[PDB]
Amino acid sequence: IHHHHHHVINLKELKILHTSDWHLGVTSWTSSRPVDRREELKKALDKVVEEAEKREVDLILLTGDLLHSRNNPSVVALHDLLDYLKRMMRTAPVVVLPGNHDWKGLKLFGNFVTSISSDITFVMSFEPVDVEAKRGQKVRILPFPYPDESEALRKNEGDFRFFLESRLNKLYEEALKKEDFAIFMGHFTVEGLAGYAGIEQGREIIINRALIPSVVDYAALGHIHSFREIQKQPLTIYPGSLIRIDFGEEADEKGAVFVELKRGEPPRYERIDASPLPLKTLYYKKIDTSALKSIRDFCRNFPGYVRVVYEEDSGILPDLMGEIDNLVKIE
Amino acid sequence: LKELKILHTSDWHLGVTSWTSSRPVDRREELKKALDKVVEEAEKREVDLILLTGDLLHSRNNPSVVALHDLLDYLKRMMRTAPVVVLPGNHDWKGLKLFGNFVTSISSDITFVMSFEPVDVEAKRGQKVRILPFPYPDESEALRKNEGDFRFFLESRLNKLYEEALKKEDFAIFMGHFTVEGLAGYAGIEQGREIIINRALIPSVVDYAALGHIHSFREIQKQPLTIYPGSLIRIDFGEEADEKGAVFVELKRGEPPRYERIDASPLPLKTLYYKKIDTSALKSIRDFCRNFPGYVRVVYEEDSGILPDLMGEIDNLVKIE
């Protein structure tokens, strides 16, 4: 058969796969017990790809930090990124909003790749782009990247806030000039995020969720590790990461999002669970004989990674990280 | 299909600034003009395949944003004319191999041959073209071996390419990035380690051998037809007498190949020779550079005391030796 897009007359539906924050190349807990997350991460990524093919999505949205290293990604990480980029392109057209990166050639290569393929689009600026989905649907993309060049704002918090609002207003005006569907893609922190620990060694951009253009069919956000349904109109979702990067994500549910849009109907979405390895933190005052029993008993049949937090040294501690290959951190 | 029209250009050196030690000159504007002329000629002749070899970027490992932009720009302009096959030169960046394979996988109008493995490509009119790539042996940029085991390694791959070239469909094209042994009128290595290959070891069973890495055009041999196209601009005064451009190659199954040189007409260079720099010499130098639309070098033999600031009063004079 053929392997290009279909063209269905008068089709007013759009199936979306939105995944985010892969962090390809991460090794966790380097200061205590380094753990290469690649195998677990590739397992989760395969699960998301398989779900995209089964549901026959029309469009794949990629946000957040797909690479863990901001400026020196390894060859293996780059290989995995390009590998999984191709695996999605074979399924449906891909739109990528690259996260916070420094390299200045990356925009040129992103524009080059976009120019030579009709199945992947890199949105590297604030300018809107019209793309074509798997079944011919015309989709207008409203991108809100991290304001590059001025990673140092070079201005007070008052002109900057008005600059961001002006960009959001322009995106609103461009979203009104839409054909079929319109999707917002943003790389920032929604104002007053509930249960959001804080910036993980980085400068954060804060945007009020009401400033997201209401006339878009979906708002695809990234940069935060935890899934969050920010609002319903417009439906605004952070998908979260695919693995639990650190123990702050112990209680998180990890995966991607399947969004279905229908003209005339309200949008609906399902969470695609990647079911990565679990995390557990064990708390003790001192590591006494009672604590040693609780640690060894829990870790023995726990299929994930364990952290132990204690207050005071009570003598010499046994080689717990030797008898327990599951124990990755004792502070 | 039993015909194949080829545009072969090489060694663009995008991003070069000439004569940095004396009077830097950004060659970008001149180079883009020459590149535009080659692109236009590819469209006019309606080539079926475009071959890119040599140093498309002047900087081996730190190309500027402007240079990278121009490279990707003219890559796209070539892809719009006919399918492109690129033999990238010696580079350090390790992502280059992954990105090259990625771009090749996602577009059916460009192919980056990043290894010794043969690749089959399809030309504009459906011609099946087998590419026999001979890149600079990466990893071992330091040979890590004597000249005897290394030479046998290279010969083994040329033999392998010969055997793979025999298993061809329509046409077979060799692409190599090396220096042919005993090049006639070849100054020498321009600040680099050279790999030397005897031209008789180029597999004779290919329809065309597209070479690069040399600034000056060379017809190495006719069976198999082996050509360096040369650079598109005169990078330095050693190329003063060179004619610069690309090569248009026409192949016909069963017939001998023929080629035409496509003149890019870049700026001319001129070297002025004097015994000593006397007052008559300054007048002649200033008068010549005033009406010369290119770049001028002055070399003189005898110390002539202090000479006026010729490189200040003459924006045309780029080098005094």
Ligand SMILES: CCCCN1C(=O)/C(=C/c2ccc(O)cc2)SC1=S
């Ligand atoms: C798929 C692109 C194919 C063409 N192409 C490049 O993108 C290159 C890039 C490069 C980048 C950094 C550096 O330090 C040296 C080279 S070289 C080359 S050919």
Ligand SMILES: CCCCN1C(=O)/C(=C\c2ccc(O)cc2)SC1=S
């Ligand atoms: C999150 C989307 C990322 C998309 N993306 C890259 O980041 C690429 C290459 C790269 C190379 C060197 C470096 O330091 C950083 C990046 S190529 C490509 S597509």
Ligand SMILES: [Mn+2]
């Ligand atoms: Mn981020």
Ligand SMILES: [Mn+2]
């Ligand atoms: Mn993140």
Ligand SMILES: [Mn+2]
């Ligand atoms: Mn070279």
Ligand SMILES: [Mn+2]
């Ligand atoms: Mn060269």
